[PDB]
Amino acid sequence: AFPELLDRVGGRGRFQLLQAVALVTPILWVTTQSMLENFSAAVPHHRCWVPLLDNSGRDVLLAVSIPPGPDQRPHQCLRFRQPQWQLIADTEPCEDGWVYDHSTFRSTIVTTWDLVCDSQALRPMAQSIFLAGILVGAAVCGHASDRFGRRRVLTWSYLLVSVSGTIAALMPTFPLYCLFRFLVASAVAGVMMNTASLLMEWTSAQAGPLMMTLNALGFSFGQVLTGSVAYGVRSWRMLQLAVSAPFFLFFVYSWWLPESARWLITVGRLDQSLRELQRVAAVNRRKAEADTLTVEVLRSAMRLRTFISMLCWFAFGFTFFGLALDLQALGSNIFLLQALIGIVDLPVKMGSLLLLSRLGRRLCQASSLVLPGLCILANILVPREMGILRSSLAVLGLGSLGAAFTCVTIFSSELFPTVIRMTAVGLGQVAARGGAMLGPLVRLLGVYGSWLPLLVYGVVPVLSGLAALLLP
Ligand SMILES: O=C(O)CSc1nnc(Br)n1-c1ccc(C2CC2)c2ccccc12
């Protein structure tokens, strides 16, 4: 009887739009917390400290103390025991600290904790930890909202994000920074899950698509904000503070939004449900049918396809969250990137969807994985002088993976007995959040050659997409 009550109280109108506006400004700043590791953990050019240079012909002094490296650069991990003045065999690891290049970034976490050379694996692990935190928090919060309400959990998760972010920028050692970020990730996962549930709960008939696409396009405008606030704030201790502070301001105003009116009925909190419904009626201005509500009415109210879908989400997480958290290897000008991604994404997603869906439902699913995977794979062959070509195939490569998110959120999930779709979209997101933890771990394989990470990162989407043609 709840849909009839919702029709009696509103639908579309004013409040159902104010609520949407009030819970999407925070989803731009959840994508400034996830992809900040391209600007707060960026490896600059690091050389070895020398007593000759850098105080107790600059070019000759640099050439005599540091042996030449393989990639046409001074060595980043070794120095000469004694100035080899024979240069008009014996090398010792750096023992006086590195010297970094401060020309685009002032202080990253790499600069402050020396996560270079031998201690290199720790950098692709500080992201897998965060994704594991998101995975854990998206599973714990599921069993903590059906008993504590759907609005209180969001309000407290805002405060948790704010406090954990404001604390994580003031730690003196790596292990604690790898734990407070875990807490931030769990709270962020809770925020996203509850925002989606609240967005759908209050809306009927006009929500099947529109509502769950508004969360996914808040991410695309969020990237453009990461680029901008990093063009501006350049340090790393003043970036986490500036990103985590707005969540406290969101927490204060989050005390006025009404709670879900469908959860209040199944628990017996009829009186407050009535208060919430009448309050919503006044904002919606449809104060004509609301006189009907007199407690009693609310008292009466109180396999192959499945496997194909999971593989598709796994491939989005593995490839996107591994190749996008190192946009320093897909080209240059990191600030210009992370902003063209969303601007490409929205026109690309809309235009690709409109044209391809007319071919068929399976064709759109197939062409949204093989195309970006092949675009990424065809990036190795390009020589490192057509930057427009190497960067363009990267921008368009990563942007087109963002249309797989949409073409498997609404257009798909019908490939089942078709009762209701909130059965398997949930199980799909478990895979995508678990392929992201098994994500940047592939980037640990930069040794044994450097082409292999990109090769795997392009092959996996291609095989996953080509397996979708085997539906029967
Ligand atoms: O929880 C989920 O949404 C399922 S996978 C996941 N886990 N953490 C995050 Br953030 N994401 C994310 C899932 C999907 C997107 C699509 C391209 C627009 C994201 C874009 C930017 C940052 C994170 C994203």
UniProtKB/Swiss-Prot annotation:
Task: Name the keywords, alphabetized.
Answer: Cell membrane, Glycoprotein, Ion transport, Membrane, Phosphoprotein, Transmembrane, Transmembrane helix, Transport
User: Which protein family is named in the record?
Assistant: Belongs to the major facilitator (TC 2.A.1) superfamily. Organic cation transporter (TC 2.A.1.19) family.
How is the protein modified post-translationally, according to the record? N-glycosylated.
Glycosylation sites noted in the Swiss-Prot or TrEMBL record: 55
Superkingdom field: Eukaryota
Subcellular localization, as worded in the UniProt entry: Apical cell membrane
Catalysed reactions, as listed in the record: urate(out) + (S)-lactate(in) = urate(in) + (S)-lactate(out); nicotinate(in) + urate(out) = nicotinate(out) + urate(in); urate(out) + n chloride(in) = urate(in) + n chloride(out); orotate(out) + nicotinate(in) = orotate(in) + nicotinate(out)
What are the recorded Gene Ontology BP terms? cellular response to insulin stimulus; monoatomic ion transport; organic anion transport; renal urate salt excretion; response to xenobiotic stimulus; urate metabolic process; urate transport
Q: Does the keyword Transport apply?
A: yes
State the gene name recorded for this protein: Slc22a12
> Its membrane topology, per UniProt?
Multi-pass membrane protein
Q: Which Pfam family, any one, appears in the UniProt record?
A: Sugar_tr
InterPro entries cross-referenced by the UniProt entry: MFS_dom (IPR020846), MFS_sugar_transport-like (IPR005828), MFS_trans_sf (IPR036259)
Q: Which GO terms describe its cellular component?
A: apical plasma membrane; brush border membrane; membrane; plasma membrane
Kindly list the residue ranges recorded as spanning the membrane.
15-35, 124-144, 160-180, 182-202, 210-230, 238-258, 307-327, 334-354, 363-383, 391-411, 422-442, 451-471
Q: Name one GO molecular function term.
A: urate transmembrane transporter activity
**Subunit structure, briefly?**
Interacts with PDZK1.
Q: What does this protein do?
A: Electroneutral antiporter that translocates urate across the apical membrane of proximal tubular cells in exchange for monovalent organic or inorganic anions. Involved in renal reabsorption of urate and helps maintaining blood levels of uric acid. Mediates urate uptake by an exchange with organic anions such as (S)-lactate and nicotinate, and inorganic anion Cl(-). Other inorganic anions such as Br(-), I(-) and NO3(-) may also act as counteranions that exchange for urate.
Q: In which tissues is it expressed?
A: Expressed in the proximal tubular epithelial cells in kidney.
This chain's protein is named Solute carrier family 22 member 12
